Design a protein around this ligand. Structure first.
Ligand SMILES: Nc1ncnc2c1ncn2[C@@H]1O[C@H](COP(=O)(O)OP(=O)(O)OP(=O)(O)O)[C@@H](O)[C@H]1O
Ligand SMILES: Nc1ncnc2c1ncn2[C@@H]1O[C@H](COP(=O)(O)OP(=O)(O)O)[C@@H](O)[C@H]1O
Ligand SMILES: Nc1ncnc2c1ncn2[C@@H]1O[C@H](COP(=O)(O)OP(=O)(O)O)[C@@H](O)[C@H]1O
Lengths: 75, 370, 370, 370
């Protein structure tokens, strides 16, 4: 303010800012598909006590010794 | 008896079907004067067109009606077609049927409005729109092979094998002659010689066509340009003033091969030609490498073919043989194809008639385009 | 281990990361590496040459976008390393990679070299305790809480159908097609150019993805909706300019059901589902048709469920009960499955330890994944 | 050397000098060389044949004014050396140029020979420790204290629009037109002759610049003010004589916003601002419209911001927020930016040392610029 009062070629009695006036899911509600509510807390409890047998596991494309089925049994 | 009229963004090539070369070739521009409120002298035309506007460049503001193969101002394009038929060719449009050329993957409104004018304004008996790339193959007597038809407006890559086109393999790039002309102005302004006005931009296009050449190794060429003044050539303007463009000679056409210079963030004219072949079926790739055509006047740069071969060969497999097809008449490659197509008795059936247009509408063109 | 294992769903469009047990993924950001294309001149501007996730989304116009993985295959691994690094950085989960085990979620029938390198990076660059690679479909079933179901997972990169009956997944009945959400956005861009609105820039391609998500409906009858004159629904771009999408709105997402449009000789999303069921043994066909689970973000299209149910019914046998079940969080369904699997004590046995990987090598990961 | 750096703005009209410590430029004098109008053979006349700044302003009518710099380019270098020597005189600053380092402010997209010769002078003639050439636009943002912002810098010689977002300047989006304050002064002289007051002399051109600076208001609607009868406001000349300006007052600076009226092929001040934003990426357009900064002396016209806002709004997209943030110190904004930049410890790294220029070569100044 006193800085710009010192200089000669300065804008006096002019507005600083010239601005404009400040101006102020469809598939998920379908009949065809059946809407399920995902509750992981409920899901976690159902699978809680289920185990898998990783002994003698081989999912790879290995030909040796007939067919294999990964995850034998639980407990 | 039929008319071929190429609607190129840079130059409009028009002529009679069957003839070797196009009859009338003029720059596609409309020249409106920088008029003040002061009264004008005698022999005054409200809006000049083509060779007339090319003579009176000084005062007239040059406005290209077709921008990137899209007709922006239709009133301007109408005045060019009026200069094409009545004045340049000296023929009635009602008598002869007119073949026009559109670039591939253009807006649908362009083809729609184009034919509407030809049928209503000029009252043509028949009208067929064709892809520029499809015509360019006929010039070389080749049914099989890809083309890299780089124009002033756009550059497009259309692979066609055994007289069957692959539409999904077609790629369009907005980088073209006018962008290079605009790029050449900026780097000439960096040297010292400032060119701003529309008339001055036309003089920069004359500088580009004559001097500019494609370098084999850009980094190697920049090293020789810095050390020695052997590449530096002089050009006389319309004014007695002469200019020495220097390294900017071979810097302009480099923008084709690396758009990063222009700042488009897109693949180069070499890389897009490769990408288009890879998008095609694996079997037919062999012939497309063997038959890579370069069409339009943006492929008349001295030594583009050598640089093109080098860049494709590096990207492509080592076992494959890459041959670039560069005929002497590349500028008139789109038209000369049209002349061969229109002349053939088979094409007589493919014409869209007034009766066909009247009943169906302008939408009929989209069915009988290609 | 006392420290919770981190679930990372390495999706093509959006990578979703978070801790096991959490009901929803806390930190989900778009999968791309943003580099600044414009030059830095001023002091105090945005620091770094790499922008990932929300910082990249805010300053999108400044940056040039580059997707690291395409069709569920990591093309650039250097970029994939930086995004996984960003997951562990202060902005997202903010923990050390050495303390928490990881759960990675790759698509089915991807290349073996991808799984090998994915493991190499996650064990060497990050010193993770344990990594388990799993299929997207197997997890999606744990989330819904169902043992029997076919999982049609239409992602951004790849759309696949995996028939799973009473825990077991049938590896020979797995059907995968490259055509997916990102190809629909690419096919939409092509049709927007035909309408006469160009989106050449990598940043502008993200606006085409935004147009797709907001305004695109799958018509129940394709040939019917083609003929009828459509209401030209205007969309507001980021700058403010209005575009009329018109016919391209409903023609674009039809690519998923008809891959002939883009010009790829593959099965449609409707054909993929029925083929997957028909490939399975006679007895289970009726149970798999009854239990269909949609997954991925590209199933959220308006009238996808309506169209698929129409298309499946024609191909499927007469008088069979076809129930298509949609979890409300289709997009996050894959991750939620990961969290539930990770929380179980059985997951401890499933893991590959560092020492186990170090001894055997690549084989150990291939042995234990499906 | 640690001693305070000397900022100097290379303004075609007014060069602004001073130290980096000062909040405002202490010494700012007109950029023209003053020689006696009558060719002086005799004694008792103006001695030295050199009058610069305040000495020239005193004996103005006797001397003949010759501007050394035209359109942001140095035409006469011998004159410019004398001007920069007067910056290091007893009149202004009163210091050794060999002690203090220097910062120049060259306009964007100037000739490279202009930058090279500017450095050669400041390193050879004056024995400067270090020199740094910078862009006028980038400085203007440092003064205001915002990283993002478009800078419409309307000087005396050149008017240029540079868009910078988050400290990243897009070099392709820069727009430069030669129609600046000096051209408005030239066109006002023509209209003053149309009112019937001749200012033929080079000294009499200076008072036309004073008449312009004193009384010239930009009407919101130009057509309504022309039909309305003017007050004919009297201006007082140095001799004492009165001149009634009348309609010439408002229809002179209009030629900035509409340069086709006189017959100059340019875009216009409203157009270059909008075009510069539209040329930039779509994501940034909204933020660049929301941050516009007016710089230079040819924005201080009464009702410039009022007209520009109206002329930008109609060209710009509908329902977009347009904030044209003018500082109070527009004339001295470019220097204040340099004064802040110079003060920072980062500037120590940015500038090129005298020994660096001797060893590295000519490129040294160009490569370190950005
Ligand atoms: N010999 C040349 N060397 C370099 N550039 C040239 C040469 N001749 C023309 N050009 C440039 O390339 C453009 C070639 O335009 P051309 O005459 O092929 O018409 P066009 O509008 O591109 O038509 P089309 O798109 O149908 O090919 C010119 O506008 C010019 O900028
Ligand atoms: N509302 C929507 N409508 C249509 N498509 C959508 C919608 N939301 C997202 N998409 C699409 O789905 C993609 C998200 O894929 P996503 O399910 O996250 O992948 P993945 O399953 O491989 O992790 C988006 O990139 C977009 O293409
Ligand atoms: N108060 C004013 N009102 C109108 N025009 C002015 C005013 N002050 C300066 N000008 C004009 O602007 C010019 C000053 O330009 P300037 O801002 O010094 O340019 P630069 O940014 O290149 O240094 C003067 O020569 C005059 O034409």
């Amino acid at each position: 303010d006193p800085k710009y009062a010192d200089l000669p070629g300065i804008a006096r009695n002019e507005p600083d800012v010239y601005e404009t006036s400040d101006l102020p899911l469809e598939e998920l509600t379908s009949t065809s598909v059946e809407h399920i509510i995902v509750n992981p807390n409920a899901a976690y409890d159902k699978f809680k006590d289920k185990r898998v047998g990783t002994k003698g596991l081989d999912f790879s494309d290995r030909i040796g010794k007939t067919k294999r089925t990964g995850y034998e049994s639980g407990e | 008896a039929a008319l071929v009229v190429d609607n190129g963004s840079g130059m409009c090539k028009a002529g009679f079907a069957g003839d070797d070369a196009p009859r009338a070739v003029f720059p596609s521009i409309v020249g409106r004067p920088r008029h003040q409120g002061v009264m004008v002298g005698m022999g005054q035309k409200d809006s000049y067109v083509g060779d007339e506007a090319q003579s009176k460049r000084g005062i007239l503001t040059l406005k290209y009606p077709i921008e990137h193969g899209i007709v922006t101002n239709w009133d301007d394009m109408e005045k060019i077609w009026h200069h094409t038929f009545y004045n340049e060719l000296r023929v009635a449009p009602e008598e002869h049927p007119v073949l026009l050329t559109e670039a591939p993957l253009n807006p649908k409104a362009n083809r729609e409005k184009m034919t509407q004018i030809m049928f209503e304004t000029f009252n043509t008996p028949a009208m067929y729109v064709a892809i520029q790339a499809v015509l360019s193959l006929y010039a070389s007597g080749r049914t099989t092979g890809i083309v890299m038809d780089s124009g002033d407006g756009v550059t497009h890559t259309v692979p066609i094998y055994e007289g069957y086109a692959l539409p999904h393999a077609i790629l369009r790039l907005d980088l073209a002659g006018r962008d290079l002309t605009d790029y050449l102005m900026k780097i000439l302004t960096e040297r010292g010689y400032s060119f701003t006005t529309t008339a001055e931009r036309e003089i920069v296009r004359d500088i580009k066509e004559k001097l500019c050449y494609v370098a084999l190794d850009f980094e190697q060429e920049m090293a020789t340009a810095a050390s020695s003044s052997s590449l530096e050539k002089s050009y006389e303007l319309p004014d007695g003033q002469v200019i020495t463009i220097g390294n900017e000679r071979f810097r302009c056409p480099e923008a084709l091969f690396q758009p990063s210079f222009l700042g488009m963030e897109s693949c180069g004219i070499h890389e897009t030609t490769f990408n288009s072949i890879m998008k095609c079926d694996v079997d037919i790739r062999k012939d497309l490498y063997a038959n890579t055509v370069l069409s339009g006047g943006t492929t008349m740069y001295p030594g583009i073919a050598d640089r093109m071969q080098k860049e494709i060969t590096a990207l492509a497999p080592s076992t494959m043989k890459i041959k670039i097809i560069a005929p002497p008449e590349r500028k008139y490659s789109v038209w000369i194809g049209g002349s061969i197509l229109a002349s053939l008795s088979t094409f007589q059936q493919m014409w869209i008639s007034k009766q066909e247009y009247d009943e169906s509408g302008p939408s009929i063109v989209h069915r009988k385009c290609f | 281990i006392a420290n919770q294992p981190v679930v990372i769903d390495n999706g093509s469009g959006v990578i979703k990361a978070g801790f096991a047990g959490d009901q929803i993924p806390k930190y989900c950001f778009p999968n791309y590496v943003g580099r600044p294309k414009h030059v830095r001149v001023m002091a105090g501007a945005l620091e770094g040459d790499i922008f990932i996730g929300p910082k990249a989304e805010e300053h999108r116009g400044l940056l040039s976008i580059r997707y690291p993985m395409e069709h569920g295959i990591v093309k650039d691994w250097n970029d994939m390393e930086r995004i996984w690094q960003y997951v562990y950085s202060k902005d997202q989960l903010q923990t050390f990679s050495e303390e928490h085990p990881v759960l990675l979620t790759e698509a089915p029938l991807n290349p073996r070299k991808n799984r090998e390198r994915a493991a190499e990076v996650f064990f060497e660059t990050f010193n993770v305790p344990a990594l388990f690679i799993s299929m997207q479909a197997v997890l999606s079933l744990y989330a819904t809480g169902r043992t029997t179901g076919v999982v049609l997972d239409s992602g951004d990169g790849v759309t696949h159908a995996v028939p799973i009956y009473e825990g077991f997944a049938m590896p020979h009945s797995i059907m995968r097609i490259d055509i997916a959400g990102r190809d629909v956005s690419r096919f939409l861009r092509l049709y927007l150019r035909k309408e006469g609105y160009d989106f050449h820039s990598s940043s502008e391609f993200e606006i085409v993805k935004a147009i797709k998500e907001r305004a695109c409906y799958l018509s129940i009858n394709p040939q019917k909706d083609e003929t009828l004159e459509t209401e030209k629904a205007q969309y507001y771009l980021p700058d403010g300019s209005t575009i009329e999408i018109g016919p391209s709105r409903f023609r674009a997402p039809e690519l998923l059901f008809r891959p002939d449009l883009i010009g790829e000789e593959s099965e449609g999303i409707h054909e993929v589902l029925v083929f997957a069921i028909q490939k399975s043994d006679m007895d289970l066909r009726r149970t798999l048709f009854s239990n269909i689970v949609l997954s991925g973000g590209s199933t959220l299209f308006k009238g996808f469920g309506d169209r698929l149910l129409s298309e499946v019914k024609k191909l499927a046998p007469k008088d069979v009960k076809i129930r298509i079940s949609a979890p409300q969080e289709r997009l996050y369904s894959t991750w939620i499955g990961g969290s539930i699997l990770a929380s179980l004590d059985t997951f401890k046995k499933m893991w590959v330890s560092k020492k186990e990987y170090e001894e055997d090598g690549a084989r150990s990961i291939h042995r234990k994944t499906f």
